[PDB]
Structure 1
Amino acid sequence: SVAHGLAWSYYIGYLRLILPELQARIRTYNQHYNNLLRGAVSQRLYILLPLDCGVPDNLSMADPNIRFLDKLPQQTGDHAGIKDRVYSNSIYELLENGQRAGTCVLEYATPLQTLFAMSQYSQAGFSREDRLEQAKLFCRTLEDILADAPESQNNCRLIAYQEPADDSSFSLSQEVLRHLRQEE
C-alpha cells in the first residue's frame, strides 16, 4: 500500500538516522547553546500526526501557544551521492496561561503532506477517503516498526490526533503538553 511504503521510508531514511544521535544533540544544545536562564530542552522527538494530513509549514504561526525558539545543531551525513546532506530539527516552546510550560523538539511527519498532495492531484488517482485510511495505516505501520526498533521508540513520541469537523475547538499545545507531561 501507499502508507506501508511511506512509513518504511520515514523510518529508513530519517528516523533510524536521526533518533540514535538525537540525545547527544539535545544535551549538546542544553549545555552550550540553550539560554543560561531557561529550562533544558526535553529529550525525545515529538512527531505530530494529524490524521486529516493538514500540515502547515509554519507551526510557530498557526498556533499562538506554540512558538519557535531555536534550532538544534545540524546533523550531516552523506546519503545517495549527496555529500553532507543536512538533517535539522527545531525547538519549540509550549504556552499554558500565557507562560512557558514546556520546551521540546517538535515537528509534523512529513509524509502526511505527501498523502495530502496526492489527494489534490488528479494524476495520483487518490481520493480524500483513501487519504484518511492511508493516514491511519501510516501511523499504525509506523508504531509497529518503532516497537521493535533499536533506533528507538524511546527517542520519540508519536502524537496522532483528529480535529473535529463538528468544531469543538481543538488545542494542539495541550496535546503536546499532555504527551510531554506523561514523560515527567
Structure 2
Amino acid sequence: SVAHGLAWSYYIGYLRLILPELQARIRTYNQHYNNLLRGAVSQRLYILLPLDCGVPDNLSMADPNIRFLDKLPQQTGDRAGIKDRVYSNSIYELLENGQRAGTCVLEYATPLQTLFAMSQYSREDRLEQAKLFCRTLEDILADAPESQNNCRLIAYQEPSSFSLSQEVLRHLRQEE
C-alpha cells in the first residue's frame, strides 16, 4: 500500500535522522537566556496529522493563534550524494486569549500532501490511507530506539468551529 511506504520513508528518511539530535538542538536553543525569557521550548517534536490530508505551508494560515517565533539551529548530513542536506525545524508560540500559553517545535507530516495531491479531484480512500499512515508510523515509533518521549503525533479530523492551537496545547500540557 502507498501509506505503508510513505510512513516507513517518513521514519527512515527523516525521524530516524533528526530525533536522536532533537533534544540537544532544543537544549542549545533554551540555554540562550534571551530565548528562555520569552518561554521554554517544549522537548518534543509535535507532528500534525490532519486525516483530511489538508497540509497548508503556513501554520498562521490554518490558525492565527499559532505564531512563528524562530528556527531551531539547523542539523546537516551528507545523504544520497547531496553534501550537507539541511534539516530545519520551526518554533511556534501558541496563543490563548491573545497571550502565549506554550512554545514548541511544530510541523505537519508532509507525506499527507502526497495523499492529498493524489486525490484532490476517493475522499473515503484518502481517509483510509491517512489512518493507515498514522497507524503504521505509530507502530514504527513504538518499536524505534530513536523515539524516546521526544516525538508526539497529533491526529485529528476537522468538524469551521475548530482550534488547531487548542488541539496542540491539549497534547503539549499532557506531556509537561
**TM, length-normalised to structure 1:** 0.92
Distance 1:105 1:36, change over 3 A: closer
CA contact (8 A) 1:65 1:173 kept: yes
Tell me, in whole angstroms, the C-alpha distance in 2 between the residues paired with 1:65 and 1:118: 30
- After TM superposition, the runs of 4+ consecutive aligned structure 1 residues lying more than 4 A away are none
Q: How many residues align?
A: 176
What CA RMSD, in Å, does the superposition of the two structures yield over aligned residues?
A: 1.4
Which residue in 2 is equivalent to 1:181? 173
CA positional deviation for 1:178: 0.3
Distance 1:33 1:139, change over 3 A: farther
Which residue in 2 is equivalent to 1:143? 138
Tell me, in whole angstroms, the C-alpha distance in 2 between the residues paired with 1:11 and 1:37: 34
Distance 1:129 1:153, change over 3 A: farther
Q: Percent identity?
A: 99
CA contact (8 A) 2:69 2:91 kept: yes
CA positional deviation for 1:52: 0.1
CA contact (8 A) 1:34 1:40 kept: no
Distance 1:36 1:2, change over 3 A: closer
Q: Once the two structures are superposed, what CA deviation does each residue of 1:140-181 show, in whole Å capped at 9, x if it has no partner?
A: 0000011011011511100000001xxx61111000000000
CA positional deviation for 1:33: 7.5
**Deviating more after overlay: 144-153 vs 88-97:** 144-153
CA contact (8 A) 1:94 1:177 kept: yes
**TM, length-normalised to structure 2:** 0.96
CA positional deviation for 1:62: 2.7
Structure 1: runs of 5 or more not aligned = 122-126
CA contact (8 A) 2:46 2:151 kept: yes
CA positional deviation for 1:36: 5.0
CA positional deviation for 1:34: 5.0
